[PDB]
Paper text:
IgE’s interaction with CD23 modulates both IgE production and functional activities.CD23 is a noncanonical immunoglobulin receptor, unrelated to receptors of other antibody isotypes.
To determine whether the absence of this calcium‐binding site affects the structure and function of human CD23, CD23 mutant proteins with increasingly “murine‐like” sequences were generated. This study offers insights into the evolutionary differences between murine and human CD23 and some of the functional differences between CD23 in different species.
Author numbering: 158 to 291
Write the structure that this text describes.
Amino acid sequence: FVCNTCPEKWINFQRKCYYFGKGTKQWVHARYACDDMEGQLVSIHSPEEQDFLTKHASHTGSWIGLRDLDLEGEFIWVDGSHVDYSNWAPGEPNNRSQGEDCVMMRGSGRWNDAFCDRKLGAWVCDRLATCTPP
């Protein structure tokens, strides 16, 4: 009936749980780290979800679950969903023809693209919250 239960060290917002990771990681690094924890690198689909992430975001930048796929020819989230909501910094993205294929979130919450082998100090995972029983 009510789904706001999250594992130790994760934070609940709406029906989801979020892990604000800290550590030195390239994008595909953070992708597998989230998978190891039974989550996914975060997908963002509304301004309310973004505003929650901004309140907890590392000041020095974080990987999120968006990257440019060559065959589909667009940015696609790790869970296969398309970009509806977006929060690009003004002028972004600007490195698609330039090999900057992975997306990070600044301390402001705004997104920019980057080289996938860039090292950042933070990354965010999500998973679904579990629910109250009968």
